[PDB]
Amino acid sequence: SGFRKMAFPSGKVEGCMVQVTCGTTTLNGLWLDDVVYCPRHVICTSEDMLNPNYEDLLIRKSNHNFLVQAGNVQLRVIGHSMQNCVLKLKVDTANPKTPKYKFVRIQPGQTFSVLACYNGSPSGVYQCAMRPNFTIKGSFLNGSCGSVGFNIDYDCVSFCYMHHMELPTGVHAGTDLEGNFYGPFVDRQTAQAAGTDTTITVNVLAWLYAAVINGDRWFLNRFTTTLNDFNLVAMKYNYEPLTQDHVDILGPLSAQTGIAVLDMCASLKELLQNGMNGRTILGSALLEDEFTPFDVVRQCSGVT
Amino acid sequence: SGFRKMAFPSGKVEGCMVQVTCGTTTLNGLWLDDVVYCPRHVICTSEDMLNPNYEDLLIRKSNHNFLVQAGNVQLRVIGHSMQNCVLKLKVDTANPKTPKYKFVRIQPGQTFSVLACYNGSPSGVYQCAMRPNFTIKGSFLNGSCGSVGFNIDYDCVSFCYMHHMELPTGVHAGTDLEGNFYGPFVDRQTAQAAGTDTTITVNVLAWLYAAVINGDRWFLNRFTTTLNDFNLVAMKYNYEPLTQDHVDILGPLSAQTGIAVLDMCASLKELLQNGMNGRTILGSALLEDEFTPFDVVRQCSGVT
Ligand SMILES: *CC(=O)N1CCN(Cc2cnc(Cc3ccccc3)s2)CC1
């Protein structure tokens, strides 16, 4: 028993982290097979970041300008190309620690682990969610760009995020491993405001199910509701609308606990309307939304 | 910017996890050099756990009864011994992935990362703290025993915890790597109640400093207090007494923010007395106590 904000084991990803330096900028790269992926803003000076023309800046760079170091050994760059907002640096050596992998583009509400790195070296691992406004709330200092987000399915690492920037409000933006930003963000030091950071309703319900499985049951009430009634309340509280797809995904949790999804929605509705009254659920005084239904099943079952 | 509950990268520890089976019980083992460490209750049947005499049960076990598997390859056991509540299984092969390591016994209030494992395979990593009542609030299912807690200092892993049991209240108990339980707990299926789970005051103050460094400043007030006055309030709220040693340890955070430790104590005193009033600090609606002052400095500076 017990329920924790749990990250995937990071070993498979640690073996892929490298340092990439172009001129005076050093950030992280992801080395998979004979390609190193990194944010294209590694070619920028702090002056360039204000309004960079990446194609033009890249013309002044040659393979030998990209210094790639894996541990304390230098990798030989034999090609370079820009794919959207990432650079792909072809090296002459395949990463011998390359795990089975995929590049996936996640949907808002999906969680993933981040291996925060500096100078190609891992500093820590934590769990994030792609917010409904396409930002993530991470922990990233200067030098952390190029750190990646991922999920693991037994032995296959699905990379979903590469860190590129921090908005003026302290929230984070990045791309998938094809270099496409999540949301409307651009790799430019310009006015970029995030939209409404709504709560991931389906995740909150999954976490309420985890609470029941782990013994926290005070919030269970004698009520039920409908999808439409619940959604009127969810709209009022800046929660994402709950769909039949979300109800279906919560089916295994509903089956395990014997609590119908709509009954849990009515418990959530009362928590939104009445608050916690100074009480806690799974050690939290707020409704946690960074556990998906899959995460709750995975953690409550013990998938390795 | 941003502040997350961050675990150490788990790769160095993943390379040490093995499966240990004795009869019908399978749990995790830690393989360092040519020794595999595991909870001694691996020799128990569910019937034995009620009142086990470990020395007597161990007499009926031989080296060949301890099945140790690292990945899909079997390790040859050439010796076995009991040290307190752990068994040390000498194998004929040194773990080629053994990192630089130490065995440390932590004090309450200290944090560490846990690599939750099942059948010698890593499932996830999360951050814990040794509670003042010597329990930890983990996420452990049956089969997770033998999973370990650790800290890392650059390339040296300091192992501090091995998981042994869950109390009837859903909290966890275990040993250091010398096999001595933290607290008064015993490896027996018997009535073991935990003492008061008080809040780790020095950790809360460190986390308030992290909040200020990361932009959350609403809770800063116009007041100050003294150690004795603050401690009268801390006693009332089941917070650990703050000592001059704790004040000294908070010195670098005080210096970085320009907020004197006693002024932060006065902010904490008002938060205890008035509550949060529906507001949050670093995404939390409660005062977080599982970040030490060292953790805050480490994360806010980017140590790898
Ligand atoms: C996320 C990440 O690692 N990066 C993107 C943001 N930059 C910010 C900086 C750029 N240059 C720096 C050093 C400097 C400061 C002032 C004048 C000249 C150079 S920090 C870091 C990389």
Ligand SMILES: *CC(=O)N1CCN(Cc2cnc(Cc3ccccc3)s2)CC1
């Ligand atoms: C923490 C950990 O991994 N362990 C300590 C607690 N045991 C509990 C169990 C013991 N035997 C089990 C299977 C069984 C159930 C009922 C009757 C006979 C066998 S679960 C697991 C290991």
